[PDB]
């Protein structure tokens, strides 16, 4: 697989970069608990990305939502998220991503989670932004999610 491997160089034109942090920051900002509920719909949609947490595999979204376990990897996405969006720098991407690929990797976890990940928060940036989603921004958010895709997931050992 890997075709390039590795290079990205300048990624995004900067006016894709105005507008993936400034909407990202937009999100955070007025929805509070907006990453739990992106993985509570997930999991309506795809019931089997449940069953890739063993333990909550079988919870009801309300003791779904006061699960330790689906708090803290709720923020720990939160928070790689909010580091790339700090300045959208594709080469401070594989350090970041790496034991992520390597844990998802060992429970399983791959592109049709992924991909469902990015399906679900385009919705929800959509929820939010109204009428005023128009296209630059689909594009420039695909465009970071491409960047991103690009170099996901292993070489575990
Ligand atoms: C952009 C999306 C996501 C990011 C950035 C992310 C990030 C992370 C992080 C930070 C870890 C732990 C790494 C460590 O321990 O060093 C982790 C673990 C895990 N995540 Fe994700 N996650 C994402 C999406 C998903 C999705 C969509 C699923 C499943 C449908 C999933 C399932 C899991 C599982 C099963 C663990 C369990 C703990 C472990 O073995 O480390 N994640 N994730």
Redesign the pocket.
Known sequence: GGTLAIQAQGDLTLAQKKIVRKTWHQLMRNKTSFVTDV?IR?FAY?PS?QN??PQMAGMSASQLRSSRQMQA?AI??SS??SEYVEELDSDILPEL?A??AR??D??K?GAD??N??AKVLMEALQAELGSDFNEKTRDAWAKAFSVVQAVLLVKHG
Do not use: G, P, Q, S
């Open positions: 993985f997930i795809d990305a890739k947490f990897h720990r996405v790689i998220m991503l034991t992520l844990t998802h060992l429970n976890v989670h992924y469902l990940f």
